[PDB]
Amino acid sequence: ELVRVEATVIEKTESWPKINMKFRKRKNFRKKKIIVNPQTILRINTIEIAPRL
Amino acid sequence: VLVCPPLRSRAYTPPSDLQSRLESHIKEVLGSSLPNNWQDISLDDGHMKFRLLAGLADGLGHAVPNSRLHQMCRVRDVLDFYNVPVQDKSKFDELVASNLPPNLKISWSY
Amino acid sequence: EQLTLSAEFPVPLPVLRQTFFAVIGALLQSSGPERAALFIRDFLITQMT
Amino acid sequence: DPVLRKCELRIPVHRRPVQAWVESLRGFEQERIGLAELHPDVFATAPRLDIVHQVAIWQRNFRRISYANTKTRAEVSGGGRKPWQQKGSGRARHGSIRSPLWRGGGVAHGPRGPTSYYYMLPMKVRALGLKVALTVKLMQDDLHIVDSLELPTADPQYLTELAQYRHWGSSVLLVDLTHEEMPKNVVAATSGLNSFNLIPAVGLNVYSMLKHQTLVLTLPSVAFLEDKLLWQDSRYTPLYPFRLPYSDFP
Amino acid sequence: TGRGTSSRFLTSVLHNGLGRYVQQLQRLSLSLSRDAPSSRGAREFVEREVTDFARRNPGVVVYVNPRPCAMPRIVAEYLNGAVREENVNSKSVEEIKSL
Amino acid sequence: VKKGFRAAFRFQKELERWRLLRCPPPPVRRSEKPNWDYHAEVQAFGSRL
Ligand SMILES: [Mg+2]
Ligand SMILES: [Mg+2]
Ligand SMILES: [Mg+2]
Ligand SMILES: [Mg+2]
């Protein structure tokens, strides 16, 4: 009852490429992985309170 | 010094009077006054099959492909095959004349 | 800017500004005052955040 | 007068025959002049494309001879002596200026001499491939049985227009029974065309059928092809080469 | 790689969510070949999914250009002025639709 | 001289990139560039908002 918070979805995207390269003898430059994750952005709109304490 | 008739289209639509034209040919070929059970008359005879199918192609303009002849066992099959339309329109051609939304634009560069 | 018709590109700022308000004027005639007031709030009043 | 043909050989009882329109080339509109029956075991075999793959590759590879060659360290000019002594110089140890490591030396693992790629597929397998190819053309409506190859005129243009008229492909392969008796009119018209090719019946092969869009067979050749292929079924193994005299075989 | 690349702060184009949300994508271009195995999947996408996508998103203008082509390609342009380009060589309908 | 044209084709693309950086092209209005229909663009402008 006390508090209401509302938000909006603005963008749905992916992260920039992240390099993961495990430490191993004979590492080499091609024993490498690229990780990209999905992302979303929210904008907070309003915060409201009511006299019900 | 021969001459060549102009090329035709390959589109065929079942004529409305299919039954009348089909049976009329059958009576003429059979010459037996449309015996009952006409739909199930066997076409195994070679001479009968040629006369019926050859005449129909010339008049209607549509002929059975070489692949489908062996399937024409009975007069019903000939009746069934002729009632399906054939259209040469491309899948793209149908798309263009299909009431496209206002934000979609197409152009043919070929 | 993309839809503007003018003799110089890039469009000069005084020309660009004029066409912007003309669009609001066209919106006013078509849909009336209440709609345009929401238009100004959304796009101009936001710039003072 | 319909032209009606029946298979000379015995069709299996459980299999119904298949048919095609007989045609003639004497005019632009003589599309249908007859009706013909074709042995189901030839023109209605199962659609096996793996076998078609094998026979096409056999034809291309069994003739191949490659003439690529390289010299080994033994065959390059010079190189006999040891360049310098093992110790003292401070260079790498070496024993000839023509080893693979050196500029101008021999090749370690290169092509060697003329090499052949010969092999033979079993005779029954090669015969089966021909049946499958003939079946494919019929089922896809690319085969046209004709009574004879006689033509009204020898002008090459006439033949091309006829193909356009009847919805044929850009490339056409024409088969006749024997080379010696082929009609004069056909020979003159085809000889000047790149894409229209005339061959005798004995020259039919899987590879040419794939290359050419539409196949044209005269009726005498149809009986010819039916006889040879069906013989491969219901035969013994050879006691000795078939060219030698046999009781019932030509 | 962080020290080898640029960075920025989180932002929005024109305060997108404050008053009203506006879709940034405004134009798509797709090029095809009539008869080429590489572009088969793109052809099916036009046959099935192109019209439905246009209706759900009415603020995007879509251009489809069949022409002799070696690689089918898609170009996307945005209101802020960015341009992005993607190859669609020999991809399935599902891959293109999700992209 | 190696056999093949694909490497030569690729390198032409990079020469294009280098030339652009050194000599940036003058701006042009989008109307001149391909894939433009004025009527359709205007309608999407309204629906966008
Ligand atoms: Mg030596
Ligand atoms: Mg010695
Ligand atoms: Mg030595
Ligand atoms: Mg050498």
Side-chain angles (χ1 to χ4, degrees):
Chain A
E1 300 90 359
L2 293 165
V3 192
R4 185 195 197 68
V5 179
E6 284 180 359
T8 302
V9 167
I10 304 312
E11 208 190 9
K12 311 172 76 170
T13 48
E14 59 202 12
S15 81
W16 75 304
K18 297 176 192 167
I19 291 189
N20 188 350
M21 178 150 161
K22 313 185 188 177
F23 73 99
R24 291 172 189 265
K25 62 176 289 299
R26 192 180 73 184
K27 298 173 188 63
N28 310 131
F29 168 83
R30 328 177 180 200
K31 274 175 65 180
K32 171 173 46 63
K33 325 175 166 185
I34 300 297
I35 296 151
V36 300
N37 302 112
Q39 289 170 336
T40 55
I41 312 179
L42 296 159
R43 183 185 290 286
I44 311 295
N45 282 119
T46 68
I47 308 181
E48 312 165 314
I49 45 173
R52 293 191 205 187
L53 294 171
Chain B
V1 183
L2 305 151
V3 181
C4 192
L7 302 164
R8 293 91 66 198
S9 164
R10 198 177 58 249
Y12 158 87
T13 309
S16 78
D17 64 356
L18 194 151
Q19 286 289 342
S20 75
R21 294 184 183 175
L22 172 55
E23 62 210 20
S24 82
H25 274 301
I26 288 173
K27 305 161 197 176
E28 181 281 328
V29 164
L30 293 179
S32 180
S33 87
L34 197 154
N36 281 320
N37 214 31
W38 64 300
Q39 279 213 356
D40 300 355
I41 301 168
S42 178
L43 283 77
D44 303 334
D45 167 29
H47 193 279
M48 174 165 298
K49 193 182 274 197
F50 176 77
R51 294 293 197 199
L52 169 55
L53 295 178
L56 278 167
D58 293 314
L60 290 198
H62 188 75
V64 184
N66 278 306
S67 45
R68 288 173 174 294
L69 272 69
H70 60 100
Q71 309 194 140
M72 305 318 201
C73 297
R74 298 181 168 265
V75 185
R76 284 185 293 93
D77 295 340
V78 180
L79 166 53
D80 308 344
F81 164 85
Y82 290 158
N83 74 5
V84 299
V86 166
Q87 70 288 1
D88 58 346
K89 255 182 153 189
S90 174
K91 181 73 59 183
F92 174 92
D93 296 338
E94 293 178 351
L95 186 67
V96 171
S98 285
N99 181 27
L100 308 163
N103 58 328
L104 194 151
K105 295 280 164 156
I106 302 171
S107 57
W108 187 260
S109 299
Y110 273 109
Chain C
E1 187 164 18
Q2 306 188 9
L3 282 158
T4 310
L5 303 187
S6 80
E8 292 179 350
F9 185 78
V11 180
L13 269 62
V15 167
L16 189 73
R17 189 209 186 206
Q18 179 174 357
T19 58
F20 176 82
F21 285 115
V23 160
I24 289 170
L27 166 60
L28 198 149
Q29 295 205 357
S30 307
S31 74
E34 288 70 1
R35 302 297 307 281
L38 288 173
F39 187 92
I40 290 183
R41 191 193 66 188
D42 300 358
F43 299 94
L44 292 184
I45 296 292
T46 42
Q47 295 296 339
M48 77 192 286
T49 47
Chain D
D1 295 335
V3 184
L4 316 179
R5 176 212 171 260
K6 314 288 162 297
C7 304
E8 296 79 357
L9 278 297
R10 166 195 51 68
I11 297 185
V13 173
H14 79 274
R15 294 212 72 193
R16 168 180 291 273
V18 69
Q19 297 182 354
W21 287 111
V22 168
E23 327 184 6
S24 184
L25 303 162
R26 289 163 182 288
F28 285 130
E29 298 185 5
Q30 313 185 29
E31 292 185 350
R32 37 191 82 87
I33 292 186
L35 209 71
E37 274 184 350
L38 314 165
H39 204 289
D41 284 354
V42 177
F43 294 82
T45 81
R48 297 184 62 90
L49 295 181
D50 47 337
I51 293 179
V52 160
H53 181 75
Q54 289 180 77
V55 177
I57 282 170
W58 167 80
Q59 271 179 111
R60 201 187 164 194
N61 284 8
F62 87 103
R63 292 181 168 286
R64 185 192 178 188
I65 300 169
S66 69
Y67 298 95
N69 193 68
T70 57
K71 288 173 162 68
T72 61
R73 55 182 301 172
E75 302 164 338
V76 174
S77 168
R81 69 215 277 158
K82 183 175 185 54
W84 51 86
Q85 62 194 6
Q86 288 285 106
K87 291 181 179 183
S89 296
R91 297 209 60 161
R93 305 178 298 188
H94 290 283
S96 164
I97 58 146
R98 304 293 191 213
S99 86
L101 304 202
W102 287 60
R103 171 191 179 270
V107 191
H109 299 296
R112 288 299 287 161
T115 78
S116 65
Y117 294 72
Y118 174 77
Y119 72 101
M120 287 296 299
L121 284 172
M123 183 161 69
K124 283 170 184 167
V125 177
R126 287 181 270 127
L128 181 50
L130 262 181
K131 296 199 283 269
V132 180
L134 282 170
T135 302
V136 164
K137 302 302 253 195
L138 177 66
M139 290 294 109
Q140 289 191 331
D141 294 303
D142 276 310
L143 174 65
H144 300 307
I145 305 293
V146 166
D147 52 359
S148 57
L149 278 164
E150 198 62 65
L151 278 168
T153 187
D155 170 17
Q157 180 63 10
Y158 165 87
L159 186 52
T160 73
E161 288 158 325
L162 194 159
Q164 308 167 36
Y165 188 71
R166 299 204 199 169
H167 295 264
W168 289 354
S170 50
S171 46
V172 184
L173 173 62
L174 297 79
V175 178
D176 184 19
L177 183 59
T178 49
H179 180 88
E180 63 87 15
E181 62 86 18
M182 302 212 266
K184 302 314 205 70
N185 266 353
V186 189
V187 168
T190 51
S191 73
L193 287 166
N194 273 358
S195 50
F196 294 9
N197 300 149
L198 177 70
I199 73 164
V202 65
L204 191 77
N205 67 93
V206 168
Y207 184 94
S208 66
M209 288 197 279
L210 290 175
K211 178 157 176 77
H212 295 93
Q213 268 157 3
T214 74
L215 182 55
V216 178
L217 296 192
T218 68
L219 276 166
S221 84
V222 180
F224 177 96
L225 292 186
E226 263 192 355
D227 182 12
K228 300 313 210 323
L229 300 187
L230 291 156
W231 175 77
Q232 286 289 332
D233 300 330
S234 77
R235 75 159 162 84
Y236 277 116
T237 52
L239 282 170
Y240 42 75
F242 284 130
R243 66 180 224 274
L244 271 62
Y246 267 95
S247 161
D248 52 357
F249 185 79
Chain E
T1 300
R3 290 192 74 138
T5 303
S6 52
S7 70
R8 72 178 170 85
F9 285 113
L10 196 57
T11 47
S12 52
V13 176
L14 263 177
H15 304 108
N16 200 7
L18 274 188
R20 73 181 65 189
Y21 161 78
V22 165
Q23 190 183 23
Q24 301 301 326
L25 174 64
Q26 68 160 355
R27 195 182 300 91
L28 277 182
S29 308
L30 171 57
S31 50
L32 299 171
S33 166
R34 175 205 300 171
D35 45 359
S38 68
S39 69
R40 181 185 50 143
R43 278 192 296 264
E44 308 321 318
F45 171 84
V46 160
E47 291 171 58
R48 290 161 29 167
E49 305 298 335
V50 65
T51 47
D52 302 333
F53 172 87
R55 278 167 189 146
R56 288 184 315 267
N57 296 313
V60 178
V61 185
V62 184
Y63 300 89
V64 162
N65 303 320
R67 53 150 160 273
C69 192
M71 289 208 200
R73 202 175 293 92
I74 285 170
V75 185
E77 307 183 58
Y78 295 75
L79 292 167
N80 75 357
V83 182
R84 186 160 152 189
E85 196 157 355
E86 296 288 325
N87 281 283
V88 182
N89 181 62
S90 81
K91 288 184 179 179
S92 80
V93 194
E94 300 189 15
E95 289 174 346
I96 303 171
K97 190 184 180 173
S98 61
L99 160 60
Chain F
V1 68
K2 319 197 178 207
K3 62 192 82 163
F5 66 90
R6 292 185 65 242
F9 178 81
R10 282 185 81 172
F11 203 66
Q12 288 287 350
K13 293 185 146 179
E14 292 203 1
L15 290 175
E16 182 55 18
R17 284 203 305 98
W18 297 345
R19 184 177 315 114
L20 290 197
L21 286 180
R22 305 187 293 86
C23 305
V28 165
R29 67 187 80 178
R30 178 73 177 70
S31 299
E32 311 303 352
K33 298 199 276 274
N35 285 345
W36 193 248
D37 178 11
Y38 199 74
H39 194 216
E41 296 283 350
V42 182
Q43 310 182 40
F45 174 96
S47 61
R48 204 171 292 124
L49 298 152

